[PDB]
């Protein structure tokens, strides 16, 4: 009944009810006007005519490799370009944050309560006739139906961009610090009150935890040495609340920042690598500052790893994902003369789009062994059995599945894919097309346009009837990928802005923090600025195995 149920206001104008059956659009700063903020202001028109589409830009960035080569070697140019890509995203995210699962209108509760994931688009009001507002039927199509018909994997579809298991697990480990859904509260709630890259998955969300994981000597983290190898400490020793199935051997009950990594050998591998890297940095800083104590050594090392993490995620992780010939760059300075807010609140939608399960292979091949999902979750012995070196060599070789494309979600994890659908509905997410508009993308006019094919499109048409009622999550996994890419337009365009805010919005990226003294000097600052996924592994994995996010 809410007069705003149809999402009448366009171009980001805000809808407000003015009576039981009337609404008004607030076109403030939208660059448009009119009842629905659709009539463009001269300049708006000018601007629109000069903005190239994401696909045009993606094309240019993935061609002319030759010129990108010269650019990649002209620091000034490279900076110049990276600045464009940075600021081009900027105007997209609301910061300070606005809506959340419970507030379709700005409120102090929505703003102040850090326990909620924020929302890029407000929820669909509870009193709307249909789930997407007023379009579609009283009900959205059965999620099991959608799941099976177009999401489930028949034959493994390998990622054309070459993503491997090193990448798949890094994605899982990394995002685990900020996507920590508070299940006891609901899908729209989080336990990551830091709302970003704070590395709480290494150090713990709370002081009490952090303290239990620290050695309180040289600023280091506690650790045990098994067979000459450094691994996280045990639960018996640290007493960090964490309860493993009772059969797990004592020394195999690792204590790490994130209480959920302890299961997966692949997650525990990164946990071990970063723990190792912390100590490494501690040793380096101690050498430079024989006069420092444990606290500063610890704190300064944590600041450096946060920087290393952001450096790697931009120049290695995102670089890979992008497919660009242009070398992405981590340079906070690029934003210093720009209007930018050094704050971030994780969006529910960022969490949703990130459900990249099709990445998972059907089996995990380590050395000669091949493990099923069942024997590769909760079994830390595999890691101790093969060792970090073998794990790296193996994960570097194994290719990951394509995400966009359609039908590539491993059946072994189908309940997770169904939950994404079910939960998005719970949090009353708006349609795929509403989110596309929300991000300056042209809405799709047909399911065939979305998938770029006929079979799945037809099955989707059968289930949804109207493209304007199509859901965001399923659409992301079925969307026509880009030329030999892992993702389609919608995934890149919604995720990029969320990522930039989470990465560049970190305090250490702000002017007052971005200086050598913040990281113990030029030495510590260099660790951040020369960081790469290869260095991280090389420095912390016996043998310095070669590694990258793509399968050679």
């Amino acid at each position: 009944a809410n007069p705003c149920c149809s999402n009448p206001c366009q171009n980001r104008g805000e809808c407000m009810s003015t009576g039981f059956d009337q609404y008004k659009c607030d076109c403030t700063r939208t660059g448009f006007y009119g009842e629905n903020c659709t009539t463009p202001e001269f300049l708006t028109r000018i601007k629109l005519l000069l903005k190239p589409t994401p696909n045009t830009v993606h094309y240019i960035l993935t061609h002319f490799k030759g010129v990108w080569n010269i650019v990649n070697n002209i620091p000034f140019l490279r900076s110049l370009i990276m600045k464009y890509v940075l600021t081009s995203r900027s105007y997209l995210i609301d910061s300070p944050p606005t809506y959340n699962v419970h507030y379709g209108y700005k409120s102090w509760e929505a703003f102040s309560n850090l326990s909620y994931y924020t929302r890029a688009l407000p929820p669909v009001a509870d009193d709307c006739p249909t789930p997407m507002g007023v379009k579609g039927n009283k009900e959205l199509p059965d999620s099991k139906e959608v799941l099976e018909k177009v999401l489930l994997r028949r034959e493994f579809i390998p990622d054309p961009q070459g993503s491997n298991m090193m990448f798949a697990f890094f994605a899982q480990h990394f995002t685990a610090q900020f996507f920590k859904t508070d299940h006891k509260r609901g899908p729209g709630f989080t336990r990551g009150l830091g709302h970003g890259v704070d590395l709480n998955h290494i150090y713990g969300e709370t002081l009490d935890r952090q303290h239990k994981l620290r050695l309180f000597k040289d600023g280091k983290l506690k650790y045990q040495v098994i067979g000459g190898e450094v691994y996280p400490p045990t639960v018996k020793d640290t007493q960090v609340e964490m309860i493993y199935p009772p059969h797990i051997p004592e020394n195999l009950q690792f204590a790490v920042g994130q209480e959920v990594f302890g299961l997966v050998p692949g997650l525990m591998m990164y946990a071990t690598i970063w723990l190792r890297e912390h100590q490494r940095v501690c040793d380096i800083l101690k050498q430079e500052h024989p006069e420092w104590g444990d606290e500063q050594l610890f704190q300064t090392s944590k600041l450096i790893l946060i920087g290393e993490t952001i450096k790697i995620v931009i120049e290695d992780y995102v670089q890979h994902l992008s497919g660009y010939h242009f070398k992405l760059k981590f340079d906070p300075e690029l934003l210093f003369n720009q209007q930018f807010q050094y704050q971030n609140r994780i969006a529910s939608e960022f969490n949703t789009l990130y459900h990249w399960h099709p990445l998972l292979p059907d089996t995990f091949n380590i050395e000669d062994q091949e493990y099923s999902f069942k024997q590769f979750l909760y079994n830390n012995s595999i890691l101790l059995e093969h060792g970090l070196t073998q794990f790296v060599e193996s994960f570097t070789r194994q290719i990951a599945g394509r995400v966009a494309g359609g039908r590539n979600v491993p059946i072994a994890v189908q309940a997770v894919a169904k939950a994404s659908i079910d939960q998005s509905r719970e949090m009353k997410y708006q349609s795929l097309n509403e989110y596309r508009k929300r991000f300056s993308l042209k809405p799709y006019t047909s399911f065939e346009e979305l998938t770029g094919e006929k079979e799945m499109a037809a099955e989707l048409k059968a289930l949804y009837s109207d493209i304007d009622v199509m859901e965001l999550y399923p659409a992301l996994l079925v969307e026509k990928p880009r030329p030999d890419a892992i993702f389609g337009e919608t995934m890149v365009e919604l995720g990029a802005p969320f990522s930039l805010k989470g990465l560049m919005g970190n305090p250490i990226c702000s002017p007052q923090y971005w200086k050598p003294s913040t990281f113990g000097g030029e030495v510590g600052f260099k660790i951040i600025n020369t960081a790469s996924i290869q260095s991280l592994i090389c420095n912390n994995v016996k043998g310095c195995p070669f590694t990258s996010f793509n399968v050679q």
Partner: peptide
């Protein structure tokens, strides 16, 4: 690169 080269040797 540089680190991999010397450390791998």
């Amino acid at each position: 690169t540089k680190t991999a080269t010397i450390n791998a040797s």
